[PDB]
């Protein structure tokens, strides 16, 4: 699976709080990507490993 989200808002929370971000909202979902290569996502200047 590749990192994907149904709305911009879901992604915004995922970056801010990785641990407590809710995977599924009332009408939107977000998938955390799982793969051998762990790429580093650097939106804004908040880094999520």
């Amino acid at each position: 699976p590749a990192l994907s989200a149904s709305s911009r808002a879901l992604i915004d929370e995922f970056m801010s709080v990785k641990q407590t971000h809710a995977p599924i909202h009332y009408g939107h979902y977000i998938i955390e990507e799982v793969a051998p290569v762990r790429r580093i996502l650097k939106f804004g200047n908040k880094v999520v490993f």
């Binding site: 699976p1 995977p23 979902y29 998938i31 799982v34």
Partner: protein, 99 residues
Amino acid sequence: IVTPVTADVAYFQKSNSPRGRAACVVSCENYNQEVAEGLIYDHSRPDAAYEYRSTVNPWASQLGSLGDIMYNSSYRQTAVPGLYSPCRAFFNKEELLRN
């Protein structure tokens, strides 16, 4: 791949086959095709992965479904062998039996 809207999200958070069933043939007998085919295409029995469901989307798993027609090397003969197909590995029936 065209998919019913309703397919469960829980199927997309884990590494799985893009069709509605898992197609690993390693579990099946080393030298027997029909039982090997029975894993890939038989929906009288639930797939190995999920017991409570036979298939997430029936438009790809089924032998003749939209997914099968578009990506099988059988029907995709007229098309020029120019460009790579990501889905070819998962739908090409011949390759799946090789394992």
